[PDB]
Design a protein around this ligand. Structure first.
Ligand code: A1H4G
Length: 506
């Protein structure tokens, strides 16, 4: 659960909540109401409230006087199970999440929505067990739970399904369905009736199986959807996606081993065990030779990806072992080697025309070709002692992404991804496309999600369903924190919009 995040609270509201409703060890996180990508962890200690800044420019959550993390849920989990210190160096304990009652970031909460608007959506878009909660209109301050129940098999409105409305009273900021338990929030109420469904007198079980899906759109409707989300609506949609990251706390035990600690660019940004790339055929003398900070990303609903960090000096040999083993023939690099004077990826390829050995692997840089937004390096990768293992690996190095934030226009990213796509498609049986930035989650996640969405539209044309948050959530189940900021989220929509618009101009 992610109840400790309060989306619509000020700093002074946060202090007053912790001092009146919390104890020492209580904590909550909140966004800056202005500067986006700024968050604050507010913590009660010795009867007073401290505020700790968390910045995200696109690559990771950077907690002041703490560490860097892939998600705020992973940050909270780390500190609640271990470390966090103030400037004078004193320990700040995160013991007791201070829960938020605001329903605005729940997928099922649709706010103003009228009752006829709600029946039409559940009828057209909904399925058995699809539900939503909306404000009443007839009884102001109260709410309505609308639920669809029925036989999904039919392709006609033949009375085999129906919508039921359940009035939710709000009496003294507790919520109830007219009887029984009174809940501190709509979330507690929905969670209760999700496990213990209401039964009608004549037997119908009002099963709350899934929130109504309103984010799946026809690709042709993209421009209208961007217009609706710009009236922001992008913020609400993104924060609803972020609220689901508590469902993605999969184990990362391999990355936590002592033997593997120094193979991580950031100690707490780690690959999930279940999708990590396992390196085989290692040196028998190296005790733990199977680890790289990289995950297979397999779109689920033909191309797959490996999402990885920028190489460290001590992982370059591992990186080439990964590329060789997986039969990857295309690398996508989305950072400069150095940004803001700090190393984001070591140079792991030879100079133009040069040959280098990286342990058992040999790489030739055959030729570099410079475009406005990117450099292409044609590399030849082989295993030392086995000349018939040579294959070309095409390295696409995107060089113009801004140091902070996202490109103001998606055209360059789209032209780059189109080229990468055609390269990959031209090579029979090519393995996954390797995509890396610095930590391998922010830019890397953005490029991979764009590529996925654009691949649907390229094969099906403008009449295909896409669902941006659903696709992100699927990718975030395979590597932590894929797509870091609201700015990248909006950029994904803008890239899909631009891609559609240029397909209609052709
Ligand atoms: C309905 C809705 N959905 C979303 C998602 C969204 C979509 C689809 C997802 N599917 N899954 C599971 C999964 C498994 N594999 N892949 C995805 C999670 C998903 C989320 Cl979080 C992100 N923002 C959203 C906003 C809304 C509507 N808002 C109205 C205003 N008040 C807040 C609600």
């Amino acid at each position: 659960s992610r109840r400790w995040f309060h989306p619509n609270i000020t700093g002074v509201e946060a202090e007053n909540l912790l001092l009146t409703r919390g104890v020492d060890g209580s904590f909550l996180a909140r966004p800056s109401k202005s500067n986006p990508g700024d968050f604050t962890l507010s913590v009660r200690r010795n009867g007073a409230v401290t505020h700790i800044k968390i910045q995200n420019t696109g690559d990771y959550y950077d907690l002041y006087g703490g560490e860097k993390f892939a998600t705020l849920a992973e940050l909270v989990q780390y500190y609640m199970e271990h470390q966090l210190k103030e400037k004078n160096g004193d320990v700040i304990e995160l013991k007791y999440p201070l829960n938020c009652a605001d329903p605005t970031s729940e997928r099922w909460f649709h706010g103003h929505l009228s009752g006829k608007e709600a029946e039409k959506l559940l009828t057209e878009k909904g399925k058995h067990g699809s539900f939503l909660v909306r404000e009443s209109q007839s009884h102001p301050g109260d709410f309505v739970l609308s639920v669809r129940t029925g036989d999904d098999k039919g392709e006609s409105n033949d009375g085999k399904s129906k919508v039921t409305h359940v009035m939710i009273r709000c009496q003294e900021l507790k919520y109830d369905v007219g009887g029984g338990e009174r809940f501190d929030s709509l979330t507690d109420l929905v969670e209760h009736y999700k496990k213990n469904p209401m039964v009608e007198t004549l037997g119908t079980v009002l099963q709350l199986k899934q929130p109504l899906n309103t984010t799946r759109i026809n690709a042709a409707e993209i421009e209208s959807r961007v217009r609706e989300l710009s009236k922001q609506g992008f913020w609400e949609e993104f924060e609803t996606l972020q609220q689901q990251e508590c469902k993605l706390l999969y184990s990362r035990k391999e990355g936590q081993r002592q033997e593997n600690k120094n193979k991580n660019r950031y100690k707490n940004i780690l690959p999930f065990d279940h999708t990590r790339v396992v390196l085989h055929d290692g040196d028998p003398n190296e005790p733990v030779s199977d680890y790289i900070n990289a995950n297979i990303i397999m779109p689920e609903f033909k191309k797959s990806y490996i999402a990885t960090q920028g190489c460290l000096q001590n992982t370059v040999n591992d990186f080439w072992r990964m590329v060789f083993q997986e039969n990857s023939r295309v690398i996508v690099m989305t950072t400069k080697e150095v940004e803001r004077g700090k190393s984001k990826c070591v140079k792991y390829w030879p100079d133009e025309y040069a040959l280098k050995e990286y342990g058992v692997m040999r790489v030739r840089n055959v030729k570099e070709s410079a475009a406005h937004d990117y450099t292409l390096r044609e590399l030849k990768l082989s295993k030392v002692g086995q000349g018939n293992t040579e294959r070309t690996v095409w390295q696409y190095h995107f060089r113009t992404w801004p140091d902070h934030g996202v490109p103001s226009d998606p055209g360059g990213v789209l032209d780059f991804l189109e080229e990468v796509h055609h390269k990959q498609e031209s090579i029979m049986d090519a393995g996954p496309v390797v995509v890396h930035c610095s930590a391998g989650i922010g830019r890397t996640g953005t490029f991979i999600v764009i590529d996925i969405l654009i691949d649907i539209i390229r094969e099906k044309g403008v009449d295909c369903d896409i669902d941006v948050p659903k696709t992100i959530q699927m990718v975030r189940s395979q590597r932590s924190g894929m797509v870091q900021t609201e700015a990248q989220y909006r950029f994904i929509y803008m890239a899909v919009q631009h891609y559609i618009e240029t397909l209609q101009r052709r």
